[PDB]
Amino acid sequence: SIKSEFAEGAAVFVEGVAVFLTMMAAFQNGDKEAVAQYLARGASLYTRHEELLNRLLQKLRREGNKEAVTLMNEFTATFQTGKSLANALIAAFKNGDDDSFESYLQAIWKVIAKMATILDQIAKAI
């Protein structure tokens, strides 16, 4: 259903945020191996999340839920362009570039806060 698939996608989001937080703390501790592992885990969450968001967006469009479709457009535009920041974070990791890595952590955290706010709004529109 729209409600159950929304909730499952929210759960993947929550997992993504949990991995992100552990990757930030691993960075602060200098733990190259843990960062590498969490980067890899975050990327497999992208594939699953994208499948869930696309199907839900289809389903909302087809029900004609204008408010929810508008909000999901905001969420999915943010998700898709956010991939560029994630790729830049990976690039910085391969470059052993701590300054850039830290700065893209900050940027991705802001994207996550914006996504969390939109998700709260979508919950109330379905």
Side-chain angles (χ1 to χ4, degrees):
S1 75
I2 283 168
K3 274 150 187 304
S4 70
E5 291 166 33
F6 171 79
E8 177 169 15
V12 171
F13 180 70
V14 163
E15 180 61 359
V17 178
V19 174
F20 184 81
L21 293 173
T22 70
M23 172 177 53
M24 298 202 66
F27 171 77
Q28 302 296 343
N29 290 335
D31 187 338
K32 259 207 75 163
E33 284 199 333
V35 172
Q37 167 192 343
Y38 301 142
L39 281 173
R41 169 150 72 148
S44 38
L45 291 168
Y46 262 107
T47 303
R48 177 53 168 166
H49 204 191
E50 186 174 4
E51 319 313 312
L52 293 170
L53 289 162
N54 286 357
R55 181 181 191 190
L56 172 63
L57 178 49
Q58 292 176 311
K59 284 192 179 191
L60 289 173
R61 288 198 171 109
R62 199 176 188 274
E63 234 192 34
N65 184 333
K66 276 302 103 193
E67 192 188 357
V69 168
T70 301
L71 294 163
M72 278 287 287
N73 284 345
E74 279 174 20
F75 186 93
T76 64
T78 298
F79 173 84
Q80 288 299 348
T81 60
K83 292 170 166 175
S84 301
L85 294 174
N87 289 335
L89 181 76
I90 289 157
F93 180 85
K94 299 178 180 175
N95 197 242
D97 185 351
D98 283 351
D99 198 357
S100 298
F101 195 85
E102 193 277 343
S103 297
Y104 286 117
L105 290 170
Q106 296 295 333
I108 297 161
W109 179 262
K110 285 183 200 142
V111 167
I112 284 163
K114 172 191 176 192
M115 287 175 63
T117 294
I118 296 165
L119 267 185
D120 289 324
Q121 296 171 352
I122 293 166
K124 322 213 206 187
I126 55 180

